[PDB]
Design a protein around this motif. Structure first.
Motif, mmCIF file in Angstrom:
data_model
loop_
_atom_site.group_PDB
_atom_site.id
_atom_site.type_symbol
_atom_site.label_atom_id
_atom_site.label_comp_id
_atom_site.label_asym_id
_atom_site.label_seq_id
_atom_site.Cartn_x
_atom_site.Cartn_y
_atom_site.Cartn_z
ATOM 1 N N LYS A 1 0.613 -1.396 0.207
ATOM 2 C CA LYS A 1 0.203 -0.331 0.148
ATOM 3 C C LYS A 1 0.631 1.378 0.137
ATOM 4 O O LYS A 1 1.809 1.102 0.439
ATOM 5 C CB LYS A 1 -0.768 0.170 1.406
ATOM 6 N N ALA A 2 0.854 2.374 -0.492
ATOM 7 C CA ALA A 2 1.239 3.535 -1.299
ATOM 8 C C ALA A 2 0.541 4.492 -2.255
ATOM 9 O O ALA A 2 0.138 3.758 -3.453
ATOM 10 C CB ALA A 2 2.484 2.727 -1.637
ATOM 11 N N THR A 3 1.173 5.773 -2.584
ATOM 12 C CA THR A 3 0.547 6.520 -2.579
ATOM 13 C C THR A 3 0.959 6.409 -3.889
ATOM 14 O O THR A 3 2.299 6.554 -4.182
ATOM 15 C CB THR A 3 0.561 7.997 -2.148
ATOM 16 N N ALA A 4 -0.457 6.613 -5.215
ATOM 17 C CA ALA A 4 0.564 6.535 -6.348
ATOM 18 C C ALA A 4 1.617 7.119 -7.095
ATOM 19 O O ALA A 4 2.379 6.702 -7.501
ATOM 20 C CB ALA A 4 -0.894 5.602 -7.577
ATOM 21 N N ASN B 1 2.906 9.618 -5.723
ATOM 22 C CA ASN B 1 4.174 9.818 -5.451
ATOM 23 C C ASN B 1 4.156 8.899 -3.994
ATOM 24 O O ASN B 1 3.324 9.016 -3.323
ATOM 25 C CB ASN B 1 4.184 11.254 -4.781
ATOM 26 N N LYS B 2 4.900 8.087 -4.361
ATOM 27 C CA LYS B 2 5.663 7.694 -3.024
ATOM 28 C C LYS B 2 5.726 7.903 -2.102
ATOM 29 O O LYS B 2 5.736 7.244 -0.946
ATOM 30 C CB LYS B 2 6.517 5.959 -3.460
ATOM 31 N N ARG C 1 4.688 10.653 -0.301
ATOM 32 C CA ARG C 1 3.632 10.684 0.683
ATOM 33 C C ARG C 1 2.944 9.538 1.221
ATOM 34 O O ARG C 1 1.650 9.803 1.767
ATOM 35 C CB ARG C 1 3.167 11.429 0.023
ATOM 36 N N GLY C 2 3.124 8.300 0.615
ATOM 37 C CA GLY C 2 2.636 7.406 1.179
ATOM 38 C C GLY C 2 2.672 7.089 2.934
ATOM 39 O O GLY C 2 2.698 7.765 3.397
#
Ligand code: MG
Ligand code: MG
Lengths: 122, 106, 127, 197, 167, 61
Positions: free
Chosen positions: D58-61, D63-64, D66-67
């Motif tokens: 699970k990570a922000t697509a 920009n990793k 800010r995930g």
RNA sequence: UUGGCGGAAAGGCCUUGGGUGCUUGCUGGCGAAUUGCAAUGUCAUUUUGCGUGGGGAUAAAUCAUUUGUAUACGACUUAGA
RNA sequence: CCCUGAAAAUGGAUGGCGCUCAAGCGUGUUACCUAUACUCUACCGUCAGGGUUGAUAUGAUGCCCUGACGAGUAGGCAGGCGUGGAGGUCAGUGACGAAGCCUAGACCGUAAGGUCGGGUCGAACGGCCUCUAGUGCAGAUCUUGGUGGUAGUAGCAAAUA
RNA sequence: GAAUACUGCCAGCUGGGACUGAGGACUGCGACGUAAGUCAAGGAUGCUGGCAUAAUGGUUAUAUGCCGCCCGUCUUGAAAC
RNA sequence: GAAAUUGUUGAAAGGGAAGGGCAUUUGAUCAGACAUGGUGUUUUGUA
């Protein structure tokens, strides 16, 4: 009033990055500074302890003109002039001392406690 | 001696609340030592003082007190309900507070 | 020096302000009821401002009373002041805002002679 | 009851310990947790590795950076499990979380202090004998923690020093117990025994 | 005129209250307070000190004394809700406490003009104290360690649960 | 909440204290409301209710 | 004050010697009141300033000039008693 | 009960953390938490039922006693607040300062609003009983006028210098 | 031949705690009393202390806990992309 | 000589909006009651 102006090394003195050289504003301001120093020596001030105590700029009424834009349109072309005022004062000594009396209210229990302390110690 | 404490320590946990609405008029107090309502019934009616400090001296002191009392037990684990003259300021959630032994029945 | 009264209670001491009078400058804070069809204030949702209603009404034994315990009565001259001669413990005089100072000294002197309380004995006074 | 409570994290269950500790911080007790590499999670090591890989996906697509941050140390895994149970986005939650510090091993501020346990979060008291469990240090070094062996070496050195301490303490307490037994059966001893001490 | 008039003025005569039905029956004290009981002062200037209880006064107050030779607490009155009645009992028979009453303790109230900006004892009070305490200490000398017990202060230690403690 | 079987707060629908501002009519209804309150005769109540009536409810005789 | 030990975040732990104070281990003598029937009844530690009087030490950075291994401008890399 | 059957596209949701003799599933027993609901009390209003012309002093549309009730768009009705002007009255206020305006100063009313203190200012204005209407604004891509952010921004580069 | 559990009753006794004190001459129903009278009988009194001032309180700014979507309009349905 | 909008000074807050409701802390600011009739004349201007 600094958005989208260029960045420069000479703002390091003031801890900023955005600084400029507004030559016309400097000319008008230093003319007013010279006039205030002349008024101070006419009034008989020391002319060595003077610091600029007050200065403000606010807006004069605009001076308008019009812009010719595409497809036959008119827009405005307005100058925003200034009212400037400034006051120079002598730098004086320390201002004041000897604040308020601060009268105290104590209950009987507090007074008995202070009397007990004054009795119980020296 | 070295100890002079004549009160019981307690913690201000929270206000009386539902899942999403709180009520500042009733505070919840964890008295230490008690873990059941039957032991918490001893402490009903006792005075509670929240004692804090301020920078400005008002009437000879820099220490201000907020008074209240225990009213009833709360839950199954010895938490009690307490009411104060002015309600507790809600930044004191987890702050220490004093439960005095007066008015005594013993 | 007033008549004995019960403890004065205000059910809502906070001023009722119009919704979004803080938001827009064109909206004054004099109270207007929201007649909108989707208004959260009109629909009385939780967490919004409260509305004036008849349940906030003051006690009839306590209504129109100053914290001193009297009712304010506006006076303009000595003849208006003299109507409160037999009712000093229930009414307190208040000099009107448009009375000159050289008349205000006369009204204050007559009120002090008659024992009448004046709620503003400091207007237009020179020292 | 205590200023600071030092909890030995060895043999504890992660969620039950975190739910004890979060309530302690919200009530206002200062907690420091040592030996975070010896926490236990119920379940197979492969199940918990699969769980961490599902979390790691699970990570922000766009920009990793800010995930969700996937912290790898056992103490930061415990901090994640505890921050889940504290309402950390408020000032009360931040003030609670600043009463906590969690460590791998026992650092020199706390190696000379007393360690406690939480009996309602202990693995031997909670799990049925036969259920499988994990070690948080093993799981964490499987998912990317780099310092598993240096903590083991430091813990071996600390245990040697602590055994050297405990031998002297045991000799001293045997002397004190001998003197108390020989100074018993006097009149003050019998009066204290009648009064319950 | 600025304001016109009220059409009716309210009457200024104050009415009398109704005839109450709240008589005063005397205070029924709790059972642990018998005269001669050692009390622990919970609040006040002498809080945490152990005194002996002598006589129940008229305004529901308890007459106590230290004795003054033991812990420096004089003849005094305290509130019954601000003490703990311990199980330790001494006999106070042989003390003539009927002299003291509510008029024996008068403060001589101070005027509003006399303000203490910055800053004594009755001789009748001091020989009354000297009469009673020498009769108390003769009863104190019978059982051991009471003088030391009354001289020492009371305080709660770590781990003391007052709902489990017996006094 | 109450399961109301009737309309709450409804007026009785019968006119009292007549809508006219005639001072002599008000004196007459004062006299006859005294008589209807205290003489316990049905005639006074009948004429007191008839004094309230409007013009079309008072036809000429 | 002598000697050690402690680097994970050591900043702490132990020990030698003498001085000094207290000792409720035991027995005595004097004091306490009036804070008036309770009112935290004030005893903690955190930062800063200003005075004393006692030690301790006598710098750099930036702008401007210059460089081009750098560069939209800032920034970077150089040089200059 | 669990497992296989059981494959979708941003990263992901028993609400989250997490939970394994449960913090899961089935079932049973108690204790406990709290809604504007229920019980009791106070206060406000509405409606209903009553009492009370006796002398003194007022208001009989007044005063007092008792009980029940209170959600609300479209809409209906009632009682009130405010504005311009008109008849009457207070032999009203006022150049020793009317009106207006400003005032995280005070008081009254549930509210519309009303009153006072301070500052500014310079010539008229108000209370009450009635009459009258070109009488109350946040909106209508409303009308006229003024002013912002954008913003010291786009840009001020054809015709050789 | 008993006891105890379970359920139910008492116009049996009694301890602690919280919130409320409306009303304002008398009238009523009662109780204890031979009577005078008294009472917990149609709504709180008695005693005491501190302060008498920004102490309580009001207003306002901020902080904290919980809650709170932009108004008006058409619409079955609007925070609406 | 209002408001929009702006300058200076002062106070305050500010980790991806601001504003609001209930409650209290803290700071700032502020109104009211405080005499009363009174035995009494310890009294001056003798009432
Ligand atoms: Mg052009
Ligand atoms: Mg506005």
């Amino acid at each position: 009033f600094n958005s989208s102006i260029g960045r420069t090394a000479q703002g390091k003195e003031f801890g900023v990055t955005k600084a400029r050289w507004p030559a016309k504003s400097v000319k008008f301001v230093q003319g007013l500074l010279q006039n205030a120093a002349a008024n101070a020596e006419a009034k008989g001030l020391d002319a060595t302890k003077l610091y600029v105590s007050h200065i403000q700029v606010n807006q004069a009424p605009k001076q308008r003109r019009r812009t010719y834009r595409a497809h036959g349109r008119i827009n405005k072309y307005e100058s925003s002039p200034s009212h400037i005022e400034l006051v120079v004062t002598e730098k004086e000594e320390a201002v004041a001392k000897a604040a308020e009396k601060k009268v105290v209210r104590l209950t009987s229990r507090q007074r008995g406690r202070i009397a007990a302390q004054k009795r119980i110690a020296a | 001696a070295e100890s002079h404490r004549l009160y019981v320590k307690g913690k201000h946990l929270s206000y009386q609340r539902s899942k999403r609405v709180n009520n500042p008029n009733v505070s919840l107090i964890k008295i230490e030592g008690v873990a059941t309502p039957q032991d918490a019934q001893f402490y009903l009616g006792k005075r509670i003082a929240y004692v804090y400090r301020a920078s400005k001296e008002v009437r000879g002191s820099k220490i201000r007190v907020m008074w209240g009392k225990v009213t009833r037990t709360h839950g199954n684990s010895g938490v009690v309900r307490a009411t104060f003259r002015n309600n507790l300021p809600a930044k004191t959630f987890g702050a220490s507070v004093r439960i005095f032994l007066y008015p005594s029945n013993i | 020096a007033s008549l004995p009264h019960p403890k004065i209670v205000k059910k809502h001491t906070k001023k009722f302000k119009r919704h979004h009078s803080d938001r827009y400058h064109r909206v004054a804070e004099n109270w207007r009821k929201q007649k909108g069809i989707d208004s959260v204030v009109r629909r009385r949702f939780r967490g919004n401002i409260s509305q004036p209603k008849i349940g906030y009404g003051s006690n009839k034994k306590t209504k129109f009373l100053s914290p001193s315990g009297h009712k304010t009565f506006l006076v303009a001259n000595v003849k208006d002041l003299e109507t409160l001669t037999m009712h000093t413990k229930t009414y307190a005089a208040e000099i009107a805002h448009n009375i000159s100072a050289k008349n205000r000294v006369v009204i204050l002197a007559r009120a002090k002679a008659l024992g009448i309380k004046v709620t503003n004995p400091k207007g237009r006074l020179a020292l | 009851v205590e200023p600071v409570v030092v909890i030995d994290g060895k043999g504890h269950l992660v969620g039950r310990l975190a739910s004890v500790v979060a309530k302690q911080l919200l009530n206002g007790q200062k907690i420091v947790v040592v030996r975070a590499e010896e926490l236990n999670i119920s379940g197979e090591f492969f199940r918990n590795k699969l769980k961490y890989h599902d979390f790691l996906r699970k990570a922000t697509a766009f920009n990793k950076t800010r995930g969700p941050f996937h912290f790898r140390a056992p103490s930061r895994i415990f901090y994640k499990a505890l921050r889940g149970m504290v309402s950390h986005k408020t000032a009360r939650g931040k003030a609670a979380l600043e009463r906590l510090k969690v460590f791998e091993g026992i650092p020199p501020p706390y190696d000379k202090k007393k360690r406690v346990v939480v009996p309602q979060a202990l693995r031997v008291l909670r799990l049925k004998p036969g259920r499988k469990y994990t070690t948080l240090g093993k799981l964490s070094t499987s998912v990317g923690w780099k310092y598993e062996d240096v903590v083991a070496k430091l813990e071996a050195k600390r245990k040697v020093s602590s055994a050297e301490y405990y031998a002297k303490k045991r000799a001293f307490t045997k002397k004190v117990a001998s003197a108390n037994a020989t100074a018993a059966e006097s009149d003050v001893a019998k009066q204290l025994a009648a009064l319950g001490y | 005129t600025a304001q016109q008039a009220p059409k009716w003025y309210p009457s200024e005569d104050v009415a009398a209250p109704k005839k109450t039905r709240k008589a005063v029956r005397p205070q029924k004290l709790r059972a642990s307070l018998v005269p001669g009981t050692v009390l622990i002062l919970l609040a006040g200037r002498f809080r945490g000190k152990r005194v002996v209880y002598l006589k129940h006064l008229e305004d529901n107050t308890l007459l106590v004394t230290g004795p003054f030779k033991v812990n420096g607490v004089p003849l005094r009155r305290v509130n019954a809700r601000y003490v703990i009645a311990t199980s330790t009992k001494v006999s106070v028979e042989g003390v003539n406490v009927e002299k003291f009453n509510v008029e024996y303790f008068a403060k001589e109230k101070l005027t509003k003009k006399e303000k203490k900006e910055a800053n004594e004892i009755k001789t009748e009070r001091v020989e009354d104290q000297k009469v009673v305490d020498k009769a108390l200490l003769a009863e104190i000398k019978k059982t051991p360690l009471l003088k030391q017990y009354l001289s020492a202060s009371f305080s709660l230690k770590n781990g003391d649960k007052p709902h489990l403690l017996k006094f | 909440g109450i399961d109301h079987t009737s309309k709450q707060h409804k007026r009785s629908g019968h006119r009292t204290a007549p809508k006219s501002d005639n001072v002599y009519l008000k004196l007459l209804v004062k006299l006859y409301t005294f008589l209807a309150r205290r003489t316990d005769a049905p005639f006074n109540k009948v004429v007191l209710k008839a004094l309230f009536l409007s013009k079309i409810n008072r036809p000429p005789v």
